[PDB]
Amino acid sequence: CPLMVKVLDAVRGSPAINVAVHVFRKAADDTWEPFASGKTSEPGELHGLTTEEEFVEGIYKVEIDTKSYWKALGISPFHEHAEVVFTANDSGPRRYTIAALLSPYSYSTTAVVTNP
Amino acid sequence: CPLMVKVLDAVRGSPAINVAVHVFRKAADDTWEPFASGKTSEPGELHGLTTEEEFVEGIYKVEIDTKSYWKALGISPFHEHAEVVFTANDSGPRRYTIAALLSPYSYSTTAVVTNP
Amino acid sequence: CPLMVKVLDAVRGSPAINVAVHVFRKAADDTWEPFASGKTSEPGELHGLTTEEEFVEGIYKVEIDTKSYWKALGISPFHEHAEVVFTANDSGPRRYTIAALLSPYSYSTTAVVTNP
Amino acid sequence: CPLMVKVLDAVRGSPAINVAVHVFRKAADDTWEPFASGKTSEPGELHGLTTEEEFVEGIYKVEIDTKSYWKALGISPFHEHAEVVFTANDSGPRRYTIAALLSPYSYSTTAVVTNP
Numbered sequence: 001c002p003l004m005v006k007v008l009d010a011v012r013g014s015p016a017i018n019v020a021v022h023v024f025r026k027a028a029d030d031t032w033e034p035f036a037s038g039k040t041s042e043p044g045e046l047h048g049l050t051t052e053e054e055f056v057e058g059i060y061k062v063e064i065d066t067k068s069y070w071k072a073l074g075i076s077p078f079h080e081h082a083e084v085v086f087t088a089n090d091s092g093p094r095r096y097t098i099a100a101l102l103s104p105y106s107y108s109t110t111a112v113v114t115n116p
Numbered sequence: 117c118p119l120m121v122k123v124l125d126a127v128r129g130s131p132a133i134n135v136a137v138h139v140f141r142k143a144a145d146d147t148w149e150p151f152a153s154g155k156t157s158e159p160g161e162l163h164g165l166t167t168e169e170e171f172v173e174g175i176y177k178v179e180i181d182t183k184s185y186w187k188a189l190g191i192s193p194f195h196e197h198a199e200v201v202f203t204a205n206d207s208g209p210r211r212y213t214i215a216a217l218l219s220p221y222s223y224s225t226t227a228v229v230t231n232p
Numbered sequence: 233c234p235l236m237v238k239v240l241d242a243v244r245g246s247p248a249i250n251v252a253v254h255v256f257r258k259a260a261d262d263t264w265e266p267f268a269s270g271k272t273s274e275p276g277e278l279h280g281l282t283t284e285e286e287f288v289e290g291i292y293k294v295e296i297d298t299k300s301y302w303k304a305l306g307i308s309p310f311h312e313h314a315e316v317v318f319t320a321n322d323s324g325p326r327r328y329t330i331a332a333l334l335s336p337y338s339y340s341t342t343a344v345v346t347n348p
Numbered sequence: 349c350p351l352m353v354k355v356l357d358a359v360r361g362s363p364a365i366n367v368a369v370h371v372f373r374k375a376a377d378d379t380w381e382p383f384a385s386g387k388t389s390e391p392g393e394l395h396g397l398t399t400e401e402e403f404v405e406g407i408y409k410v411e412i413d414t415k416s417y418w419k420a421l422g423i424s425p426f427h428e429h430a431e432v433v434f435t436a437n438d439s440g441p442r443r444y445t446i447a448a449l450l451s452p453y454s455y456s457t458t459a460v461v462t463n464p
Contacts, residue, residue: 010454013343013426059196079202084195086195103451105357106358109222110333111222112247129337194245217458219242219335222333228361312407312433315433333456338457339457340455341456342453
């Protein structure tokens with residue numbers, strides 16, 4: 001799986017379940033084109049977004065719908081989403097894990113990048 | 117000054133100096149309009165972005181040019197920039213500090229929202 | 233595995249390998265007694281520290297030897313270690329993941345706690 | 349003032365007020381001696397812990413009483429306290445700010461070390 005997203009809730013100390021994730025790829029005309037999307041599972045993970053064939057070099061944006069997650073738990077959070085923007089595969093295929101650690105008024109995001 | 121940006125470098129343990137920051141506001145046509153911008157100071161802060169009169173309710177995006185910062189230090193970074201997206205909400209008086217803590221392959225952002 | 237430790241390097245965007253970890257349990261005389269220890273593997277994880285039988289209720293300290301890790305990579309970091317202190321199992325057996333995200337001058341640590 | 353402590357609340361997006369902080373210094377006998385302590389102010393800061401004369405090289409531990417803070421807000425926390433352990437090193441003039449960003453099941457700490 002060349003691209004995986006993992007989301008944790010720092011308030012509950014638990015995986016963040018049912019978080020919507022939207023992935024875009026910058027097109028030739030400099031617009032963000034839809035690339036893939038899904039929702040995190042019970043372990044807070046989203047697998048199967050793409051394939052090694054489809055995940056070509058480019059600039060990608062992973063949008064994590066944090067505001068919807070918190071609202072559904074009764075919290076009015078600060079951020080609309082978390083938006084992770086990066087160049088991928090520009091030195092050959094890599095495996096990317098995009099992790100996010102959520103609080104109502106703060107988040108961190110980390111990339112773990114390995115060579116298959 | 118209702119909006120301040122603070123940036124810290126987690127590798128050197130220092131304010132992040134000369135970091136470009138761009139602020140956008142979503143217009144009624146649903147595109148991002150340039151709103152304010154600048155470069156952080158020696159203390160890692162950017163003051164004077166806006167005024168109370170101009171900083172009306174709306175959806176804002178703060179774009180911190182992290183990649184250029186790391187490149188200047190010779191450290192290979194992951195992200196193109198850090199992006200902070202939020203709604204400003206009048207609810208009594210408020211001051212917003214958007215803080216960012218930078219590492220090459222990870223960042224955290226926190227909103228500190230206070231009443232003077 | 234009732235207790236797992238996971239360590240990531242925020243500078244390289246990689247698991248932190250060969251990080252020493254020492255776990256203590258507060259004894260009746262209020263001293264920290266050695267409980268378990270090990271080193272992280274290639275995926276940045278340390279499994280097999282304890283068993284459900286041995287991991288009784290108590291106050292535990294997980295010491296992560298961050299300074300030794302960074303020094304071996306040519307970085308003189310700020311902290312001696314990271315020290316994670318918590319009560320465990322006080323409402324029945326749980327599974328605990330203690331994660332740490334390392335930079336030379338800053339770290340975060342998160343607990344993910346699940347009910348078997 | 350060569351040592352300051354700053355604490356932020358990532359759930360409320362605010363300084364963390366009335367947080368107890370204890371500072372210890374390792375003695376020649378290798379035990380932790382009380383050094384300074386206090387409670388954070390409205391701005392989430394604790395100033396006046398020590399002086400240049402007293403803050404000599406050595407190993408220090410800053411203990412932030414996070415559990416009591418969360419309990420006061422009615423939020424179940426994971427950690428007993430946050431612990432920051434470091435060596436102070438004369439290497440030209442220096443000021444140390446120990447920052448902590450708190451969530452119930454996660455915290456980050458950063459050292460910001462500057463020359464006035």
